[PDB]
Amino acid sequence: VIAVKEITRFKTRTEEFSPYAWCKRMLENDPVSYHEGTDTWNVFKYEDVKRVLSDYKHFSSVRKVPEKIQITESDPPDHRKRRSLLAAAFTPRSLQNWEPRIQEIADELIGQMDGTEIDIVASLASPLPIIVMADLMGVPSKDRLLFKKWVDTLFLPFQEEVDKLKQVAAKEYYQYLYPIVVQKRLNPADDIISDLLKSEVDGEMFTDDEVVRTTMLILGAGVETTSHLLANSFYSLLYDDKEVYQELHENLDLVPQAVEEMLRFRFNLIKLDRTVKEDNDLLGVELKEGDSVVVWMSAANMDEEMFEDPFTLNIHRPNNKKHLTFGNGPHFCLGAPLARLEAKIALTAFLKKFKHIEAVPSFQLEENLTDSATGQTLTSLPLKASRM
Ligand code: HEM
């Protein structure tokens, strides 16, 4: 694995969190770039990133976990089958049915917020995805705090005393959930575990172990990323364009468009890796089998060939939803509708309750950021809210 910081070599976390000047420089001066220190080819332009992510015949997701559940690191023809197995639990019917459940959870969390000082990461951005996933999975509401404790340890964290805590949590999680999975095979309900147990593609079906382990992968894909989107949205409403909050407060139908502009502009720096599978000179440079390619979706999202005035936050830009933050092609995020729905529901609920927010002047961004797979992520974000 190549960390972003090995390529950017930025001095501060802040420059990764707000990397606009670097993206511009790469897009304009070196859009298909060889980085000798990591032996990577780096792709920045929108059209090139989109093509690389479509062209699984030349750019593989297999680098260098039971196989049936390894969806991200697989290529066609197995990838399609493995994705379809999981997709049975994320149908549009299910997503529509989830909306009132997610609403109720967001209402409970916002319910507990008071003109007092709120840590939006601790009070909303972290817990909402976790509590939602517990509910959607079919974990009994009585065990929510216990489940959340394991998820916090495993997926927001954060010592080779840490390794030990995670080993213990993973075992506790597995021995909690496995008997639930067993019970649900015999008595299905309307929940993710039950839908996974019934899923069948070309005669392939999940074992109970595979169901449990798929739930752990779902958490690993969805918790920290969704929390990053929620926290960054509030960051942007506090520090990027202060008028946007008022616009959304007076017109809640703008919230989905605002979420797409946060995915475009405030999800930094997200990249994906591929490995060349078939020799090719289609990016205009010849790459041979085994070469490493890094596609920078954060930069593609700032490409003026696709997005007008790309270094400005603009929720009215007509084509923000063409961003590449969820990928493109065969591996495009299976969670994207859920992620979009959680963010719309959370923001809307907060906007209903609070007329104004304001930044806390003592907050230092550099001291409240940590690494993640999808870019620098906020460990807290304080704000003052006016119930007004
Ligand atoms: C803002 C939130 C999210 C972001 C930005 C995000 C981003 C991504 C990206 C970029 C990929 C493509 C990886 C690749 O091509 O190598 C991906 C794949 C995936 N995402 Fe997400 N994701 C998010 C939330 C979620 C959630 C909530 C779930 C599940 C509940 C989830 C499940 C998946 C799965 C299963 C894949 C693999 C799909 C495949 O390989 O066919 N994601 N996501």
Swiss-Prot record:
Catalysed reactions listed for this entry: reduced 2[4Fe-4S]-[ferredoxin] + progesterone + O2 + 2 H(+) = 15beta-hydroxyprogesterone + oxidized 2[4Fe-4S]-[ferredoxin] + H2O
InterPro entries: Cyt_P450, Cyt_P450_B, Cyt_P450_CS, Cyt_P450_sf
Keyword annotations from UniProtKB, A to Z: Cytoplasm, Heme, Iron, Metal-binding, Monooxygenase, Oxidoreductase
Cysteine pairs bridged by disulfides in the record: none
EC number: 1.14.99.-, 1.14.15.8
Localization per record: Cytoplasm
UniProt-recorded Gene Ontology molecular function terms: heme binding; iron ion binding; monooxygenase activity; oxidoreductase activity, acting on paired donors, with incorporation or reduction of molecular oxygen
Binding site for heme: C333
One Pfam family per UniProt: p450
Effect of T374R: Loss of 15-beta hydroxylation activity (for progesterone and deoxycorticosterone)
Name of this chain's protein: Cytochrome P450(MEG)
Organism per entry: Priestia megaterium (Bacillus megaterium)
